[PDB]
Design an enzyme around this catalytic site. Structure first.
Site, PDB file in Angstrom:
ATOM      1  N   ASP A  35       0.835  -1.198   0.000  1.00  0.00           N
ATOM      2  CA  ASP A  35       0.000   0.000   0.000  1.00  0.00           C
ATOM      3  C   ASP A  35       0.872   1.251   0.000  1.00  0.00           C
ATOM      4  O   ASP A  35       1.359   1.670   1.054  1.00  0.00           O
ATOM      5  CB  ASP A  35      -0.896  -0.020   1.229  1.00  0.00           C
ATOM      6  CG  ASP A  35      -1.809   1.174   1.305  1.00  0.00           C
ATOM      7  OD1 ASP A  35      -1.917   1.905   0.312  1.00  0.00           O
ATOM      8  OD2 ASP A  35      -2.422   1.382   2.375  1.00  0.00           O
ATOM      9  N   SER A 199      -0.721  15.549 -12.037  1.00  0.00           N
ATOM     10  CA  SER A 199      -0.963  15.187 -13.420  1.00  0.00           C
ATOM     11  C   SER A 199      -1.218  16.447 -14.235  1.00  0.00           C
ATOM     12  O   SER A 199      -1.763  17.435 -13.741  1.00  0.00           O
ATOM     13  CB  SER A 199      -2.172  14.249 -13.488  1.00  0.00           C
ATOM     14  OG  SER A 199      -2.565  13.989 -14.818  1.00  0.00           O
TER      15      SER A 199
END
Length: 330
Positions: A35, A199
């Site tokens: 994770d 992004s």
């Protein structure tokens, strides 16, 4: 040193991926959920409340000659999905794919929430976010990667998650045969303890690319792609009959639909998520309403590039003094 381990989807939907981890001496192999959005290595154990164990493999520290109770240490964690666990702490030898760390903090669960009990395939979590998020008290502990870093050939790990198939976690090296083209690296903020990046935009299907900054985290422990409501609405508007269902808890779509791809930007590069990766199947057995793999982050507080996005790429988690992320197509 290096390590390399195969990671395997837990079910036919790729809801999560499990990776075998050797703990203790002799080794006890548990299948952990790696994770990159958390920083605790915790396991089902011989200390876990018996009614809260249902098929998981447990770590028994009393059977490990290298286990040592970390005196006074406790841990307690709550995840973004509302699940939680807590317990005490041992140090022990932990190996992943041939890479060994001695003295790793292994957080033994005394209690786990129902969602963990109900998932027999996941024996615990191995956190790969920054150690500042580790919950051990009163002395915070380091992640497996943090402990291994100095010994690795290069201070990196890579995630290569498969679509409906196994993939690979590598530590200490970048397998140049595992991706196409080049890896585009992008800046990371560690201020929230995550692999947080920006992004450069998105496209829906064959549509035009929208240049827009989307800050979010690279999180292997989250199944879906969670993005701003504007972006998610633009995606599902291209699927006839798709709608946001408050009762189901997100966007659903007719199972008869063909889903468009979704592209996200990494600098000037583009990662394409095929439409099929966005199908999470019937909302309940036999239903013709299917659950979408792109969902709004509006109620989270952060955008999350979970497995739906990451499995479309070869992802480099570069833990150099100034961390960065790398993405390549594959």
């Amino acid at each position: 040193s290096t390590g390399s381990a195969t990671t395997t989807p837990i079910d036919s939907l790729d809801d999560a991926y499990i990776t075998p981890v050797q703990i203790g001496t002799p080794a006890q192999t548990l299948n952990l959920d790696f994770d990159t959005g958390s920083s605790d290595l915790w396991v089902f154990s011989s200390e876990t409340t018996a009614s809260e164990v249902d098929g998981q493999t447990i770590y028994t520290p009393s059977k490990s000659t290298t286990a040592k109770l970390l005196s006074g240490a406790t841990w307690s964690i709550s995840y973004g999905d509302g699940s939680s666990s807590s317990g005490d702490v041992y140090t022990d030898t932990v190996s992943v794919g041939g890479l060994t760390v001695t003295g790793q903090a292994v957080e033994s669960a005394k209690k786990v929430s129902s969602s963990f009990t109900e998932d027999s395939t996941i024996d615990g979590l191995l956190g790969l976010a920054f150690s500042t998020l580790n919950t051990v008290s009163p002395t915070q502990q380091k992640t497996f990667f943090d402990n291994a870093k100095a010994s690795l050939d290069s201070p990196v790990f890579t995630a290569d998650l498969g679509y409906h198939a196994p993939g690979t976690y590598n530590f200490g090296f970048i397998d140049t045969t595992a991706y196409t083209g080049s890896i585009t690296y992008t800046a990371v903020s560690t201020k929230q303890g995550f692999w947080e990046w920006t992004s450069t935009g998105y496209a829906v299907g064959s549509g035009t690319f929208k240049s827009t900054s989307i800050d979010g985290i690279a999180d292997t422990g989250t199944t879906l792609l969670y993005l701003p409501a504007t972006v998610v609405s633009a995606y599902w508007a291209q699927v006839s009959g798709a709608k946001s269902s408050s009762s189901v808890g997100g966007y659903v779509f007719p199972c008869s639909a063909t889903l468009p791809s979704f592209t996200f930007g990494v600098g000037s590069a583009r990662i394409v998520i095929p439409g099929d990766y966005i199908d999470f199947g019937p909302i309940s057995t036999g239903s013709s309403s299917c659950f979408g793999g792109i969902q709004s982050s509006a109620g989270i507080g952060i955008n999350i590039f979970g497995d739906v996005a990451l499995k479309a790429a070869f992802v480099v988690f570069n833990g150099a003094t100034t961390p960065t992320l790398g993405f390549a197509s594959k």
